[PDB]
Amino acid sequence: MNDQTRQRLLNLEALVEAGFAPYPYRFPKTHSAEAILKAKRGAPPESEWPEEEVAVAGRLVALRRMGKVTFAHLLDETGRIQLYFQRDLTPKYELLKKLDVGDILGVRGHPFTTKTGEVTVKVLDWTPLVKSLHPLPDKWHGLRDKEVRYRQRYLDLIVNPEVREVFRRRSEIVRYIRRFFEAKGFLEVETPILQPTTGGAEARPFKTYHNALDHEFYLRISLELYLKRLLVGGYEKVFEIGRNFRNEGIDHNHNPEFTMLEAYWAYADYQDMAGLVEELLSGLVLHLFGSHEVPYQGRVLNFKPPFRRISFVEALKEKAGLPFDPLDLERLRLWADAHHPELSQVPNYKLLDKLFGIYVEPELQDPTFVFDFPLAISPLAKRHREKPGLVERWDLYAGGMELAPCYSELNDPLDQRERFLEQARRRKEGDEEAPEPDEDFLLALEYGMPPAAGLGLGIDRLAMLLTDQPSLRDVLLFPLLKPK
RNA sequence: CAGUUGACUUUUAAUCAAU
Numbered sequence: 001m002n003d004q005t006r007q008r009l010l011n012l013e014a015l016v017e018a019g020f021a022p023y024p025y026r027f028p029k030t031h032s033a034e035a036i037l038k039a040k041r042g043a044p045p046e047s048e049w050p051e052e053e054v055a056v057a058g059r060l061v062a063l064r065r066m067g068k069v070t071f072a073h074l075l076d077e078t079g080r081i082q083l084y085f086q087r088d089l090t091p092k093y094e095l096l097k098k099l100d101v102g103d104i105l106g107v108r109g110h111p112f113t114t115k116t117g118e119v120t121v122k123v124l125d126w127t128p129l130v131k132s133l134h135p136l137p138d139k140w141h142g143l144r145d146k147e148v149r150y151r152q153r154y155l156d157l158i159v160n161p162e163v164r165e166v167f168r169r170r171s172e173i174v175r176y177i178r179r180f181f182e183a184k185g186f187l188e189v190e191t192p193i194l195q196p197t198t199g200g201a202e203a204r205p206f207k208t209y210h211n212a213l214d215h216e217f218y219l220r221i222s223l224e225l226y227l228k229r230l231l232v233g234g235y236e237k238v239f240e241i242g243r244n245f246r247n248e249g250i251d252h253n254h255n256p257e258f259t260m261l262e263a264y265w266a267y268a269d270y271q272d273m274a275g276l277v278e279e280l281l282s283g284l285v286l287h288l289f290g291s292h293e294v295p296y297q298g299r300v301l302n303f304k305p306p307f308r309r310i311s312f313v314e315a316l317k318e319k320a321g322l323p324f325d326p327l328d329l330e331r332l333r334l335w336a337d338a339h340h341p342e343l344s345q346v347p348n349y350k351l352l353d354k355l356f357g358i359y360v361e362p363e364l365q366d367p368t369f370v371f372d373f374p375l376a377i378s379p380l381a382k383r384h385r386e387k388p389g390l391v392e393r394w395d396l397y398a399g400g401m402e403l404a405p406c407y408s409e410l411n412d413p414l415d416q417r418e419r420f421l422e423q424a425r426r427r428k429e430g431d432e433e434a435p436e437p438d439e440d441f442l443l444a445l446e447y448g449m450p451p452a453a454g455l456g457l458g459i460d461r462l463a464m465l466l467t468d469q470p471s472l473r474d475v476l477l478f479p480l481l482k483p484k
Numbered sequence: 485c486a487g488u489u490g491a492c493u494u495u496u497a498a499u500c501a502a503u
């Protein structure tokens with residue numbers, strides 16, 4: 001125990017001996033800080049409302065003791081509200097010197113405006129709820145370090161009330177997304193995180209052991225496979241907003257653990273789903289902001305429908321400056337190895353993802369559909385019905401990052417199995433990201449999955465745009481870090 | 485930088501003073 005910590009405890013003892021309880025069970029708060037401020041919006045200075053009564057409760061952020069009159073600022077959930085104390089008015093005024101900054105306080109009184117004009121709660125009765133054992137770090141010199149801000153988000157939320165509104169806005173996004181799919185005739189569902197075998201995307205899984213069953217399971221990397229099984233089952237419209245786990249590095253776009261949505265629509269193509277996602281995201285922004293304009297890192301992202309639609313091949317061929325057909329992997333190897341020697345030990349199929357990610361992805365700041373992906377990098381999308389080599393798939397980009405991939409689902413078992421067999425070769429060759437074949441899934445397709453359109457959507461990434469954050473850790477409440 | 489210490493009956497990164 002240090003000195004300051006001990007000094008706080010010595011003050012607690014004084015308050016306990018004085019008569020108060022050390023840690024009360026409850027406080028009957030009647031008003032919130034912002035509700036008082038909103039009520040007296042633009043009231044003239046030196047006003048009073050002794051008729052009215054209020055009771056607030058929060059944390060002491062400031063404390064300006066000026067002899068026989070004391071001031072303070074109470075920080076609740078909503079905002080800051082000023083307190084006023086006086087000797088021949090507030091009971092046990094002497095014992096206000098045993099309060100410290102950081103303590104949780106509850107007060108009763110009436111509202112009034114100072115000479116300056118700020119709305120203030122005239123304390124007629126106070127109750128020390130909690131005694132903080134450490135000093136509050138100010139915005140000035142305490143919490144500027146980003147990593148300490150993440151480790152102690154509680155401290156962050158005290159110091160920076162701006163951070164509070166980020167996660168509130170995050171919640172509203174989900175609520176809107178949910179209400180949409182709910183009202184659009186989709187069923188919310190829960191699939192297991194503990195899977196025996198993974199599949200749905202290219203990533204390395206997490207592993208874990210279970211004692212009762214005595215077998216090594218994997219953490220789910222995608223929602224697809226099990227939602228696909230429900231389609232086979234009979235459900236036509238399903239969706240889920242669950243946590244997924246990919247054992248990979250960390251950056252502004254990628255985080256090992258992340259929330260993401262997946263909806264599925266029986267007897268529909270990727271065109272049908274495209275119109276839905278347009279209505280979703282357009283209305284979402286229009287609801288949140290009021291315009292179709294999303295501030296993100298000093299840019300105005302235009303979500304006015306319809307969204308711009310480009311082809312994967314045509315866009316790459318243009319912006320990468322390719323004289324040949326990019327689907328030709330042999331010629332792309334030549335071009336790549338010469339122009340991009342860093343993409344030498346990258347496999348031939350992934351060479352498209354990497355090149356598209358360099359030349360095309362960053363230019364897509366506005367919401368842009370990227371229709372007609374290659375077959376090489378799409379194992380779960382039914383083939384294109386005109387151009388050979390491509391599939392019915394679109395990925396929605398915005399802010400120079402992928403939001404929502406949407407295949408037109410492959411329901412042919414024979415085709416699917418041979419793609420899983422192709423995928424199984426790539427793992428033997430040398431590819432950690434390519435998962436293994438789910439045999440039970442392939443069987444589920446054999447019994448017959450109806451033709452459908454599946455959606456994916458990174459909830460965390462969509463948050464970053466709408467909440468306007470640089471890194472992904474800024475839209476995660478408690479990010480993962482290496483302990484010490 | 486806070487805490488301590490004592491001052492101070494509309495201050496708002498309250499101020500002065502003491503260690």
Ligand SMILES: NCCCC[C@H](N)C(=O)NS(=O)(=O)OC[C@H]1O[C@@H](n2cnc3c(N)ncnc32)[C@H](O)[C@@H]1O
Nearest residue numbers: 200201222224254255258402403404407454456458
């Ligand atoms: N059947 C149609 C496709 C279904 C979705 C598909 N199984 C899938 O998971 N695709 S994904 O691209 O791997 O993930 C979908 C979105 O999830 C987001 N995502 C993916 N990996 C991460 C990570 N690591 N962190 C955060 N967000 C992530 C991102 O927006 C992706 O576009």
